[PDB]
């Protein structure tokens, strides 16, 4: 849900 390093 976090873009930065897709981390979800």
């Given at each position: 849900?976090d873009?930065?390093?897709?981390?979800?």
């Amino acid at each position: 849900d976090d873009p930065t390093x897709x981390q979800x």
